[PDB]
């Protein structure tokens, strides 16, 4: 069993829905396709032709690796199978077909398990993987109703100009940073090491305007590295405030 097989199975429920903020319309448009079709299968079959297939998530990174985490946490306790994009473009090409067929075979073993491809943004060696990848995802052999969603940073548009008008639709954006949306990501970062609740979350959220999810992730990451660096017991902004304004301003200069 290769490492991709043992790591491909997703466990340890990550970030949950509590980060609902800012781009609420599109996160609902992509939530009602991963949650509702599997939770309510009878009124979607009796409702008409077929339930929604999926959406597309391109554009700016913003709060990436948090919305797919939300889709993993909000699962119905039947964990699905996700695929990273780094496994597609690797040395010794040709095994991509055996991989994309063995994960569909594992989906058959897991009663039509959902398949997700993360970071698709990673020349016949690529043409066989994208043309055969369309011949497998858009093909009715494994299943045509499990899951189709490409959450990534770059679309890498090779043939979407004519392969977009079909089973895939709902061209939308990923997310966008707002002033009042970051307090929810801080509220889910409260689930980390015990932080003194006397420090208001809005006080820390209003001093970093136009901060994407990755920038505040670097706030609660570099603040943790410089917090364990300070050799203290509890985390208080009066100590790593230089790490906060330094990590939002020194990174806000170029990003």
């Amino acid at each position: 069993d290769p490492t991709v097989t043992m790591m491909q199975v997703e466990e340890k429920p990550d970030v949950t829905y509590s980060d609902v903020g800012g781009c609420k319309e599109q996160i609902e448009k992509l939530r009602e396709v991963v949650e509702t079709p599997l939770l309510h299968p009878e009124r979607f079959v009796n409702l008409g032709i077929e339930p929604p297939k999926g959406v597309l998530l391109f554009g700016p990174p913003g709060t990436g690796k948090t919305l797919c985490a939300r889709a993993v946490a909000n699962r119905t306790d039947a964990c699905f199978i996700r695929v990273i994009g780094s496994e597609l473009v690797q040395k010794y090409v040709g095994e991509g077909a055996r991989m994309v067929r063995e994960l569909f075979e594992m989906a058959r073993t897991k009663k039509a398990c959902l398949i997700f491809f993360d970071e698709i943004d990673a020349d016949n060696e690529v043409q066989r993987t994208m043309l055969e990848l369309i011949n497998q995802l858009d093909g009715f052999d494994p299943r045509g109703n499990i899951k189709v969603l490409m959450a990534t940073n770059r679309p890498d548009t090779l043939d979407p100009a004519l392969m977009r008008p079909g089973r895939l639709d709902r061209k939308i954006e990923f997310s966008l940073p707002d002033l009042e949306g970051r307090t929810h990501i801080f509220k889910i970062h409260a689930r980390s090491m015990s932080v003194e609740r006397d420090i208001r979350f809005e006080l820390l959220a209003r001093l970093c305007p136009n901060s994407t999810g990755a920038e505040i992730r670097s706030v609660c990451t570099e603040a943790g590295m410089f917090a364990i660096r300070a050799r203290r017991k509890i985390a208080t902004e009066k100590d790593f405030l230089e790490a906060v304004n330094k990590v939002i301003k020194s990174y806000a200069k170029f990003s």
């Binding site: 780094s86 690797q90 980390s192 943790g224």
Partner: protein
Amino acid sequence: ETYADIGGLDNQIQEIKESVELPLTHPEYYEEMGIKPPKGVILYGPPGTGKTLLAKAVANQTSATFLRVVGSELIQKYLGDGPKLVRELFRVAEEHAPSIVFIDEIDAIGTGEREIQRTMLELLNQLDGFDSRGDVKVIMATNRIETLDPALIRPGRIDRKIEFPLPDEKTKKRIFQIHTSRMTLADDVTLDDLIMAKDDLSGADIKAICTEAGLMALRERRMKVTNEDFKKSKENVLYKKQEG
């Protein structure tokens, strides 16, 4: 040659000291935080040569298992076996968990050639912790911070990065002070022309002329450092790297 022997950058060496001596050591301020960013710091230096970088990585040699994978030389001098050697070093590092993986003189892209990209991408995949956790730390060091591609940055540096200032004869003053802390020699030896003799040099060839200065000075059966034999032996190093 310890972490406290060199001067002028005590903050930059207590940053890597307090940074890579955090896991597996001093646990009263390590397990309460619960962060564990298993990525390690990344060093660099315009002089490089492994003397200053080795002087920074020597902090781990105090109390730890000795293990240093210096550069990808063994990757390119051997047949195209690929990342399996890195897998053997990572499994012996798994069986040797109380260690710190140090890499010096990264010459992968600075110097077949198409395999360096795939073994570097797979090196990035295995270094990021695809099937591992916070067992061992990884410290990367090279001659230029710009040699690392942007691929090796976001999943290759999440812990901390540092900046090495120009030598300004203070790292050379402290290195020469260490090389003269054991030998016996008066102040008759001019420092500036020898630390800046060719163009600039911190510790490598001054350690070389200290070795051939102890040996060449031992040829005269006198422990004193003659004012003409030291520069007379320096003419060999100055002439060697300039003739060819």
